[PDB]
């Protein structure tokens, strides 16, 4: 099996191709920036009602309705304007680890240790919410899921694989293989034709939803990648790992650009999310706090304190008006 | 907007009934299609034990979901691939995991050249051997218990307690001791 010699000689050619394509780091050409200073964001709303730790949340396209997944076995839909609960969906499996809100606002998905992405109909003619389809076929825990339309959805699983599902038939039309570690998070591009994936191997891969091939592979992290999120332009993405740092990768450059870290921060990142402009990089940490990173200068522009337990998820609205921050204290906080 | 508060009142009324059954239920993780659930109830106290099914051997991610359970039932097989020492390192990683320092572990147990400290090891007289048991069997059995207890008493930081045992009543009495210590620490008594 000494073709490993070819594999090590080929990855050196890729590494030397990245060194030649790098004139100056993004942080180097940044002195033309008016510093944003201290970003003091305050808790404008606190949605209570969840019984156990909150693992994931997802905003709707209307930026008013949001779904939250807590490990107590309940999927609550919140109206962030009036704190009113629109729906309270009981789940068959209480160990939910992710939740998704469809762009049309008619369906919501969730998954976890049951390896099943349950689809729920929110616009039944009877008026109640029940299960639409149970997407089974994954051999590992569901870590993330994102809707492409009312009938298509990609899921990430702990079996080092990602799959594209057909909600009408309940079949996997495309399975994405190539990862070696437990996949933790996914994120679609604004054109929803590509999506990056973060696994437990300090590597991120670029996928094509149609052809089902791994376009690019990005390394540079030292521990398991915990969260991932695309840039608003779809040409870059950020990663959160257990090595207590965030790194921003680049698609057409195929090289790590920025490293968001500090000596006083020795805890990993649990969630990442860009704002509407992409100027700020919000990241949830394991020290029960959230740190707003300047995506261009790599300097922390603000801290989001107030959560009494580990922050799990982070979501920025489509219009960039609010930020919902879920944590293990069974509380959701809205910031501005 | 007025009809919206009517639905919010209907939902919060259901959430209050769902809190009564969740806070009065002991959740347990069994270690040793994705997850098998088992609802058993002892002395009219509801227990919800979860057995991990179709999941890979990499546990450093999905084990954090069980950080708020009452106790993790860690079953060890007292054994050649040296399976017992592999469980010692797994119990070591679970005991010193950042999110399981407050999660107690109910240790359920069930050699000669794989542990050199077994030669000069003496049976503690505080042990209670069962009647009709060979003394060297007692020494080898309690030696494995001391290997797990040595890891459990090497880190005083954390609310986790290790309960070694050599079946449902043992879990019931242990969970009662865990919630009792949880109540004493809320009042800064223990």
């Amino acid at each position, epitope marked *: 099996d000494q073709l*490993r010699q070819e594999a090590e000689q080929l*990855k050196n050619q890729i590494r030397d191709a990245r060194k030649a394509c790098a004139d100056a780091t993004l942080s180097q050409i940044t002195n033309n920036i008016d510093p944003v200073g201290r970003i003091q964001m305050r808790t404008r709303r606190t949605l209570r009602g969840h019984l156990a730790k909150i693992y994931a949340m997802h905003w709707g396209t209307d930026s008013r309705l949001l779904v939250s997944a807590s490990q107590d076995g309940k999927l609550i839909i919140w109206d962030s304007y009036t704190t009113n609960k629109v729906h309270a969906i009981p789940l068959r499996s209480s160990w939910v680890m992710t939740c998704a809100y469809a762009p049309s606002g008619n369906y919501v998905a969730c998954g976890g240790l049951d390896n099943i992405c349950s689809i729920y109909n929110l616009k039944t003619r009877e008026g109640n919410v029940r299960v639409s389809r149970e997407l089974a076929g994954h051999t590992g825990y569901l870590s993330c899921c994102r809707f492409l339309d009312d009938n298509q959805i990609v899921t990430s699983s702990g079996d*080092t694989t990602c799959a594209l599902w057909d909600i009408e038939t309940g079949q996997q039309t495309t399975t994405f293989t190539g990862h*070696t*570690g437990d996949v933790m998070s996914l994120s679609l591009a604004p054109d929803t034709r590509l999506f990056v994936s973060g696994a*437990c*191997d*300090a590597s991120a891969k670029l996928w094509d939803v149609r052809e089902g091939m791994c376009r690019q592979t990005f*390394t*540079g992290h*030292e*521990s*398991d990648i915990n969260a991932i999120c695309f840039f608003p332009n779809g040409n870059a993405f950020a990663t959160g790992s*257990d*090595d*207590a740092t965030c790194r921003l990768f680049d698609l057409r450059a195929d090289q790590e650009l920025m490293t968001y870290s500090h000596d006083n921060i*020795i805890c990993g990142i649990t969630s990442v999310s860009f704002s509407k402009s992409g100027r700020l990089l919000l990241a949830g940490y394991d020290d029960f706090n959230c740190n707003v990173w300047d995506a261009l200068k790599a300097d922390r522009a603000g801290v989001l304190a107030g959560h009494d337990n580990r922050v799990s998820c982070l979501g920025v609205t489509d219009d960039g008006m609010a930020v919902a921050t879920g944590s293990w204290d069974s509380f959701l906080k809205i910031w501005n | 907007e007025k009809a919206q508060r009517e639905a919010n009142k209907k939902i919060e009324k259901q959430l209050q009934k769902d809190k009564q059954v969740y806070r009065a239920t002991h959740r347990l993780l069994l270690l040793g299609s994705g997850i098998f659930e088992t609802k058993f109830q002892v002395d009219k106290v509801n227990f919800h034990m979860f057995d991990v099914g179709a999941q*890979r*051997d*990499e*546990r*450093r991610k999905w084990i954090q979901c069980f950080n708020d359970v009452t106790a993790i039932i860690f079953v060890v097989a007292s054994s050649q*691939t*040296n399976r017992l*020492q*592999a469980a010692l*390192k797994l119990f*070591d*990683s*679970i*005991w*010193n*995991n*950042k999110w399981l320092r407050d999660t107690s572990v109910i240790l359920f147990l069930n050699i000669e*050249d*794989y*542990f*050199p*400290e077994f030669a000069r090891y003496t049976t503690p007289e505080d042990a209670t051997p069962e009647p009709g048991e060979d003394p060297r069997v007692t020494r080898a059995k309690y030696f494995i218990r001391d290997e797990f207890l040595r890891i459990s008493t090497a*880190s005083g930081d954390g609310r986790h307690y290790c309960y070694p045992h050599f079946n449902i009543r043992r879990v019931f009495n242990d969970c009662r001791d865990i919630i009792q210590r949880m109540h004493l620490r809320q009042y800064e008594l223990l």
Partner: nanobody
Amino acid sequence: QVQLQESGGGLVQPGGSLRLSCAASGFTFSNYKMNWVRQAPGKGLEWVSDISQSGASISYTGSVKGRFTISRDNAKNTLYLQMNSLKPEDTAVYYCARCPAPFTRDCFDVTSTTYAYRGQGTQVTV
């Protein structure tokens, strides 16, 4: 990129000596805990020895306690395993392992299959 390329190995008569070396790169060697994992032919992976980030806390398996010793040069980003008085039971592929959590007392998912952050392995035949 976590490479963790190992050195050493070879055929040594029973009762000889050998010294294994890990060539770590892509991460900070001083912040992560190191481990030694070997795979006997026809058997599963097993933990050999680990050493703390500082170098004080040291543990071995019972089959190697007293004969093998663990060492790490934090200034050189390398890990040493001086093997003394080897046995024919030590014939296995020795992998240099590293659990991903830094600054942590727990060292998870070592000695596991399909597990990254571990080297290709060196063959020590006795």
